[PDB]
Amino acid sequence: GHMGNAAAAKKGSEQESVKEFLAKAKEEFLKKWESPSQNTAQLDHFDRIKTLGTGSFGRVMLVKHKETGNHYAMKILDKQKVVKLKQIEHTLNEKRILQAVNFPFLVKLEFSFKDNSNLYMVMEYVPGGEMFSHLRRIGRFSEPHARFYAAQIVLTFEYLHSLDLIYRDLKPENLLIDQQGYIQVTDFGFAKRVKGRTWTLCGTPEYLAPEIILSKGYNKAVDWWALGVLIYEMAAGYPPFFADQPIQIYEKIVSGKVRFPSHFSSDLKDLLRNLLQVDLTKRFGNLKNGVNDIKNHKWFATTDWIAIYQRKVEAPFIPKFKGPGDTSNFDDYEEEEIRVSINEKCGKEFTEF
Amino acid sequence: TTYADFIASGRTSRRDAI
Ligand SMILES: *[C@@H]1OC[C@@H](O)[C@@H](O)[C@H]1O
Ligand SMILES: [Cl-]
């Protein structure tokens, strides 16, 4: 067979240890899931420094804790805009998830609070910038470089899925690079705790699984499709399915006729054909052996999963950091004032925040 | 080439969720 006695026993033991870890992790998550933290700081505890990124109902700002001088990334959500965009449940669920999870590649929520106008999530500042920036700067990642990042996502999804969380917005734009060159996943605005199937049309066009586009229901295997898209984009410099308009992207996805750059290794192509598999009964991560089909694939043969988790692997790219509060790895964004109304807005809608 | 088509697609910048 493929493994001699020693290798087979070692892999078996490793897989049983993952089960043991996930059992404890789930117990810890559920305690916090049922009893979330609330109101652990206030706005005048921080100086506002610079905008790090923006969206339609809020923005993320670099801030500095006045008492200790520590820097954080503070997401500011305009309650009225959140209501207008029908994002109430998404924003409450994002904060509920963030305060309950714990994993080395998930950004940590350090404080949260609200005032008359806004919601605030104060997260760790991840100063290396977005994977998106580095990928577009360098063109494409060599396969070992891509594999280093991919392994972190594999572990992170293995953890999230054990909690019945489906992530649903994987893409380089949502992955930050920390000072040691490891990945941080940040944005849980479309994640859902789901035991079985769900139906919502959500995510980003290039990363949607065929079964999200189509009316049929879908399960956590959409995240393994999205991993395939991410690995492809990291290694090629462009995603497997693109077009001028999303509707044309969806047509290509549902066909699923993927083609590969000639520099892709055969191992990489085999992995991607098994992740970018339209047939759910054949997609890696969705078969009887679960995540083990991915982790044991030849393309990951050099990956030491425990060493990745322990952050003991030397990263392929270490961002330049000229000191605390340095934003040289981020784009510039227009700076607007942060106004706090004299009158409370949408109080009842956001009681749980 | 595929890369040239990617540039021409206009979807090389940050992509919003739907
Ligand atoms: C980002 O938006 C798409 C395209 O215009 C690109 O050149 C960037 O401006
Ligand atoms: Cl952009």
Q: Are residues A147 and A170 in the same domain?
A: yes
Q: Is the dihedral of CA A149, A153, A158, A162 positive or negative?
A: positive
The answer to whether residue A95 sits within a structural domain is yes
Q: Are residues A81 and A28 in the same domain?
A: no
Q: How determined?
A: X-ray
Tell me the helices (H) and strands (E) count for chain B, helix number first. 1, 0
Supply the CATH number for residue A191's domain: 1.10.510.10
CA distances to A25, A62, A64, A107, A120 from A325, rounded to whole Å, are 33, 7, 8, 17, 19
Q: Are residues A191 and A235 in the same domain?
A: yes
The answer to whether residue A9 sits within a structural domain is no
The answer to whether residue A2 sits within a structural domain is no
**Residue ranges around ligand 1 (CB below 6 Å):** B 10, 12-13
Cα(A310)–Cα(A317) distance, integer angstroms: 18
**How many structural domains compose chain A?**
2
Beta bridge partners of A185: A106, A175
Instruction: Give phi and psi for A118, each to the nearest 5.
Output: -130, 160
Tell me which residue has its CA closest to atom 1 in ligand 1.
B13
Tell me which residue has its CA closest to atom 8 in ligand 1.
B13
- Is the separation of the CB atoms in A152 and A183 below 8 Å? yes
Q: Are residues A346 and A267 in the same domain?
A: no
Distance B13 CA to ligand 2 centre (A): 4
Helices A221-236, A131-138: inter-axial angle, 10-degree rounding: 30
Chain A contact for B2 (CB, 8 A cutoff): yes
Q: Are residues A173 and A289 in the same domain?
A: yes
Q: Which amino acid is at A154?
A: V
The answer to whether residue A176 sits within a structural domain is yes
Beta bridge partners of A64: A47, A71
The answer to whether residue A300 sits within a structural domain is yes
Q: Are residues A83 and A197 in the same domain?
A: no
- Is the separation of the CB atoms in A330 and A53 below 8 Å? yes
Quote the distance between the C-alpha of residue A237 and its chain's center.
19
Q: Are residues A199 and A228 in the same domain?
A: yes
Q: Are residues A56 and A184 in the same domain?
A: no
Residue range of the domain that includes A74: 36-129+321-351
The answer to whether residue A147 sits within a structural domain is yes
What is the DSSP code (8-state) at residue A314?
P
Q: Are residues A110 and A174 in the same domain?
A: no
3-state secondary structure of A101: coil
Q: Are residues A186 and A72 in the same domain?
A: no
Supply the CATH number for residue A328's domain: 3.30.200.20
Quote the distance between the C-alpha of residue B15 and its chain's center.
9
Which of A171, A189, A244 shows the shortest C-beta gap to B9?
A244
Order across the sheet with A46-54: list the strands.
Answer: A46-54, A58-65, A71-78, A118-124, A109-114
Cα(B6)–Cα(B18) distance, integer angstroms: 20
Active site (annotated) includes residue A326? no
Cβ-in-10-Å burial (0-12, 13-18, 19+) of A248 comes to middle
Ligand found nearest the CA of A331: 2
The answer to whether residue A183 sits within a structural domain is yes
A59-77: b or e for each residue (b if 16 or more CB lie within 10 Å)?
Answer: bbbbbbbeeeeebbbbbbb
Chain A contact for B1 (CB, 8 A cutoff): no
The answer to whether residue A11 sits within a structural domain is no
Q: Are residues A134 and A156 in the same domain?
A: yes
Cα(A119)–Cα(A91) distance, integer angstroms: 9
Q: Are residues A161 and A200 in the same domain?
A: yes
